[PDB]
Amino acid sequence: EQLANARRDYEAEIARARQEAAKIVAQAQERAKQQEAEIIAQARREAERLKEEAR
Amino acid sequence: EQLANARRDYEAEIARARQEAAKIVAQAQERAKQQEAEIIAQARREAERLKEEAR
Amino acid sequence: VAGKLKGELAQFRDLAAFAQFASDLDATTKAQIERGQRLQELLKQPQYQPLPVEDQVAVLYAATNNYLDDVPVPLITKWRDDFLAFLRTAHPEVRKLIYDNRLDRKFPTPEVKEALEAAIKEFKATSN
C-alpha cells in the first residue's frame, strides 16, 4: 500500500502542479490579451483622428 | 528493509516531486513573462503598422 | 517535410472503406487510417487565416514525426491552432530559426531539430 500510495501521491501532486501552472499562464495570457486589445483600440482611434485631420 | 526503503522512497519521492514542481512553476512563470512581454511588443508593432498605413 | 505527408495521405485514400465500416482490421491498416485522418484534419483550415511557411513546416513536422498520434481526431484543428498560438508567443525564436534556414538542402538541422522538438514536447506536456 505504501508503494501504491507513493505512486498515487506523486502523480496527483504533479498533476496539481501542472494545473496551477496552467492557471498561471492562463491569467498572464488574459492580462496580455486585454492590454493588447486596449493598445489596438487606441491605435485605431489615433488612426481615425489622423484620418479626419488629413481630410 | 522492504518497509524501510518504501517509507524513505515515499518521502524522498515527495521531495523530488516538490523539486520538479518548483521547476515546473519556474518554467510556467518564464513562459508567462515571455508571452506577455512580446504580446505587448506585438501590440506596439501593430500600432506602429497602423500609424504607418494611416500615413 | 511534405513527402511523408503525401505518401501517408495516398495510403489512407487507398484505404477508404476499411476505415468507415470494416471492424476486423489489424493495427497496420488501422494505423494508416488513423494517421491519414490526423493529416486530413490537419488540412482543415478556416477562411482568411493564412499560415506562413514556417508555421506549416512546424505543424507538418509535428504531425509526421509521430508527435501528434495521441491527439484524438476531432481536436486536431484546435491542437494546431493552440500550437501556433504557443509558437507565436512562447517561442518566436524557433519560428525565426525555421524561417532563416528553410532553404538549406537538409532542413532538419540539429540546431533546428533541437528547439523545435523541444517546443513540441513543451506544448505537449503543458497542454493536455
Coordinates of all heavy atoms in Angstrom, one line a residue, chain C residues 78-112:
Chain C
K78 N -8.0 22.3 -33.3 CA -7.7 23.1 -32.1 C -6.3 22.8 -31.6 O -5.7 23.8 -31.1 CB -8.7 22.7 -31.0 CG -9.0 23.9 -30.0 CD -10.0 23.5 -28.9 CE -9.3 22.7 -27.8 NZ -8.1 23.3 -27.2
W79 N -5.8 21.6 -31.7 CA -4.4 21.4 -31.4 C -3.5 22.2 -32.2 O -2.5 22.8 -31.7 CB -4.1 19.9 -31.5 CG -2.7 19.5 -30.9 CD1 -2.5 18.9 -29.7 CD2 -1.4 19.7 -31.4 NE1 -1.2 18.7 -29.4 CE2 -0.5 19.2 -30.5 CE3 -1.0 20.2 -32.6 CZ2 0.9 19.2 -30.7 CZ3 0.4 20.2 -32.9 CH2 1.3 19.7 -31.9
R80 N -3.7 22.2 -33.5 CA -2.9 23.0 -34.4 C -3.0 24.5 -34.1 O -1.9 25.2 -34.0 CB -3.3 22.8 -35.9 CG -2.5 23.5 -36.9 CD -3.1 23.3 -38.3 NE -4.1 24.3 -38.6 CZ -5.3 24.1 -39.0 NH1 -5.8 22.8 -39.2 NH2 -6.2 25.1 -39.2
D81 N -4.2 25.0 -33.9 CA -4.3 26.4 -33.5 C -3.6 26.8 -32.2 O -3.0 27.8 -32.1 CB -5.8 26.8 -33.5 CG -6.5 26.6 -34.8 OD1 -5.9 26.5 -35.8 OD2 -7.8 26.4 -34.8
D82 N -3.8 25.9 -31.2 CA -3.1 26.2 -29.9 C -1.6 26.1 -30.1 O -0.9 26.9 -29.5 CB -3.6 25.1 -28.9 CG -5.1 25.3 -28.6 OD1 -5.7 26.3 -28.9 OD2 -5.7 24.3 -28.0
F83 N -1.1 25.1 -30.8 CA 0.3 25.0 -31.0 C 0.9 26.3 -31.7 O 1.9 26.8 -31.4 CB 0.7 23.8 -31.8 CG 2.2 23.6 -32.1 CD1 3.1 23.6 -31.1 CD2 2.6 23.4 -33.4 CE1 4.4 23.5 -31.3 CE2 4.0 23.3 -33.6 CZ 4.9 23.3 -32.6
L84 N 0.1 26.8 -32.7 CA 0.6 28.0 -33.4 C 0.5 29.2 -32.4 O 1.5 30.0 -32.4 CB -0.3 28.4 -34.6 CG 0.0 27.8 -36.0 CD1 1.4 28.2 -36.5 CD2 -0.2 26.3 -36.0
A85 N -0.5 29.3 -31.6 CA -0.5 30.4 -30.6 C 0.6 30.3 -29.6 O 1.3 31.3 -29.4 CB -1.9 30.4 -29.8
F86 N 0.9 29.1 -29.1 CA 2.1 28.9 -28.3 C 3.3 29.3 -29.0 O 4.3 29.8 -28.4 CB 2.1 27.4 -27.9 CG 3.4 26.9 -27.3 CD1 3.6 27.1 -26.0 CD2 4.3 26.3 -28.1 CE1 4.8 26.6 -25.4 CE2 5.5 25.8 -27.5 CZ 5.7 26.0 -26.2
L87 N 3.4 29.0 -30.4 CA 4.6 29.3 -31.1 C 4.8 30.8 -31.4 O 5.9 31.2 -31.4 CB 4.5 28.5 -32.4 CG 5.9 28.2 -33.2 CD1 6.8 27.3 -32.3 CD2 5.6 27.6 -34.5
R88 N 3.7 31.5 -31.7 CA 3.8 33.0 -31.7 C 4.3 33.5 -30.4 O 5.3 34.3 -30.4 CB 2.5 33.6 -32.0 CG 2.0 33.7 -33.4 CD 1.1 32.5 -33.8 NE 0.5 32.6 -35.1 CZ 1.0 32.1 -36.2 NH1 2.3 31.6 -36.2 NH2 0.4 32.1 -37.3
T89 N 3.7 33.1 -29.3 CA 4.0 33.7 -28.1 C 5.2 33.0 -27.4 O 6.3 33.6 -27.2 CB 2.8 33.7 -27.2 OG1 2.5 32.4 -26.8 CG2 1.6 34.4 -27.9
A90 N 5.0 31.8 -27.0 CA 6.0 31.2 -26.1 C 7.4 31.1 -26.7 O 8.4 31.3 -26.0 CB 5.6 29.7 -25.8
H91 N 7.5 30.9 -28.1 CA 8.8 30.8 -28.7 C 8.7 31.4 -30.1 O 8.5 30.7 -31.1 CB 9.3 29.3 -28.8 CG 9.4 28.7 -27.5 ND1 8.4 27.8 -27.0 CD2 10.4 28.7 -26.5 CE1 8.8 27.4 -25.8 NE2 10.0 27.9 -25.5
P92 N 9.0 32.7 -30.3 CA 9.2 33.3 -31.6 C 10.6 33.0 -32.2 O 10.7 33.0 -33.4 CB 9.0 34.8 -31.4 CG 9.3 35.0 -30.0 CD 8.9 33.8 -29.2
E93 N 11.5 32.7 -31.3 CA 12.9 32.4 -31.8 C 12.9 31.1 -32.6 O 13.7 31.0 -33.6 CB 13.9 32.3 -30.6 CG 13.9 31.0 -29.8 CD 12.7 30.8 -29.0 OE1 11.9 31.7 -28.9 OE2 12.6 29.7 -28.3
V94 N 12.1 30.1 -32.3 CA 12.1 28.9 -33.1 C 11.4 29.2 -34.5 O 11.8 28.6 -35.5 CB 11.3 27.8 -32.4 CG1 9.9 28.1 -32.1 CG2 11.4 26.5 -33.3
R95 N 10.4 30.1 -34.5 CA 9.8 30.5 -35.8 C 10.9 31.2 -36.7 O 11.0 30.9 -37.9 CB 8.6 31.4 -35.6 CG 7.4 30.7 -35.1 CD 6.1 31.4 -35.6 NE 6.3 32.8 -35.7 CZ 5.5 33.6 -36.4 NH1 4.5 33.1 -37.2 NH2 5.7 34.9 -36.4
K96 N 11.6 32.1 -36.1 CA 12.7 32.8 -36.8 C 13.8 31.8 -37.3 O 14.3 31.9 -38.4 CB 13.3 33.9 -35.9 CG 14.5 34.7 -36.6 CD 14.0 35.5 -37.7 CE 13.1 36.7 -37.3 NZ 12.9 37.7 -38.4
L97 N 14.1 30.8 -36.4 CA 15.1 29.8 -36.8 C 14.6 28.9 -37.9 O 15.4 28.6 -38.8 CB 15.4 28.9 -35.5 CG 16.3 27.7 -35.7 CD1 17.7 28.1 -35.8 CD2 16.1 26.8 -34.4
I98 N 13.4 28.5 -37.9 CA 12.8 27.8 -39.1 C 12.9 28.6 -40.3 O 13.3 28.2 -41.4 CB 11.4 27.3 -38.8 CG1 11.4 26.2 -37.7 CG2 10.7 26.8 -40.1 CD1 10.0 25.9 -37.2
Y99 N 12.4 29.9 -40.2 CA 12.3 30.7 -41.4 C 13.7 31.1 -42.0 O 13.8 31.3 -43.2 CB 11.5 32.0 -41.1 CG 11.4 32.9 -42.3 CD1 10.5 32.6 -43.3 CD2 12.1 34.1 -42.4 CE1 10.4 33.4 -44.4 CE2 11.9 35.0 -43.4 CZ 11.1 34.6 -44.5 OH 10.9 35.5 -45.5
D100 N 14.7 31.1 -41.2 CA 16.0 31.5 -41.7 C 16.7 30.4 -42.5 O 17.3 30.7 -43.5 CB 17.0 31.9 -40.5 CG 16.5 33.2 -39.8 OD1 16.1 34.1 -40.5 OD2 16.6 33.2 -38.6
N101 N 16.5 29.2 -42.1 CA 17.1 28.1 -42.8 C 16.1 27.1 -43.3 O 16.2 25.9 -43.2 CB 18.1 27.3 -41.8 CG 17.4 27.1 -40.5 OD1 16.3 26.6 -40.4 ND2 18.2 27.3 -39.4
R102 N 15.1 27.7 -44.0 CA 14.1 26.9 -44.7 C 14.6 26.5 -46.1 O 14.0 25.7 -46.8 CB 12.8 27.6 -44.9 CG 12.8 28.7 -45.9 CD 11.8 29.8 -45.6 NE 12.0 30.9 -46.5 CZ 12.9 31.8 -46.5 NH1 13.9 31.8 -45.6 NH2 12.9 32.8 -47.4
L103 N 15.8 27.1 -46.6 CA 16.3 26.9 -47.9 C 17.5 25.9 -48.0 O 17.9 25.6 -49.1 CB 16.6 28.2 -48.5 CG 15.5 29.2 -48.9 CD1 16.1 30.4 -49.6 CD2 14.4 28.6 -49.7
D104 N 18.0 25.5 -46.9 CA 19.1 24.6 -46.9 C 18.7 23.2 -47.4 O 17.5 22.8 -47.2 CB 19.8 24.5 -45.5 CG 18.9 24.0 -44.5 OD1 17.7 24.0 -44.7 OD2 19.4 23.5 -43.4
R105 N 19.6 22.5 -48.0 CA 19.3 21.2 -48.6 C 18.8 20.2 -47.6 O 17.8 19.5 -47.8 CB 20.6 20.6 -49.3 CG 20.3 19.3 -50.0 CD 19.4 19.5 -51.2 NE 19.9 20.6 -52.2 CZ 20.8 20.4 -53.1 NH1 21.4 19.2 -53.3 NH2 21.2 21.4 -53.9
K106 N 19.4 20.1 -46.4 CA 19.0 19.2 -45.3 C 18.3 20.1 -44.2 O 19.0 20.6 -43.3 CB 20.2 18.5 -44.8 CG 20.8 17.5 -45.8 CD 21.9 16.7 -45.2 CE 23.2 17.5 -44.9 NZ 23.8 18.0 -46.1
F107 N 17.0 20.3 -44.3 CA 16.3 21.2 -43.4 C 16.4 20.8 -42.0 O 16.7 21.7 -41.1 CB 14.9 21.4 -43.8 CG 14.0 22.0 -42.8 CD1 14.2 23.3 -42.3 CD2 13.0 21.3 -42.2 CE1 13.5 23.8 -41.3 CE2 12.2 21.8 -41.2 CZ 12.5 23.1 -40.7
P108 N 16.1 19.5 -41.6 CA 16.2 19.2 -40.1 C 17.6 19.3 -39.5 O 18.1 18.2 -39.1 CB 15.5 17.8 -40.1 CG 14.8 17.7 -41.4 CD 15.7 18.4 -42.4
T109 N 18.2 20.5 -39.5 CA 19.5 20.6 -38.9 C 19.4 20.4 -37.4 O 18.3 20.6 -36.8 CB 20.0 22.0 -39.2 OG1 19.7 22.4 -40.5 CG2 21.5 22.1 -38.9
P110 N 20.4 19.8 -36.8 CA 20.4 19.6 -35.3 C 20.0 20.9 -34.6 O 19.4 20.8 -33.5 CB 21.8 19.1 -35.0 CG 22.2 18.4 -36.2 CD 21.7 19.2 -37.4
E111 N 20.5 22.0 -35.0 CA 20.1 23.3 -34.4 C 18.6 23.5 -34.6 O 17.9 24.1 -33.7 CB 20.8 24.5 -35.0 CG 20.6 25.8 -34.3 CD 21.3 27.0 -35.0 OE1 21.7 26.8 -36.1 OE2 21.4 28.0 -34.3
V112 N 18.0 23.1 -35.7 CA 16.6 23.2 -35.9 C 15.8 22.1 -35.3 O 14.7 22.3 -34.8 CB 16.3 23.4 -37.4 CG1 14.8 23.5 -37.7 CG2 17.1 24.5 -38.0

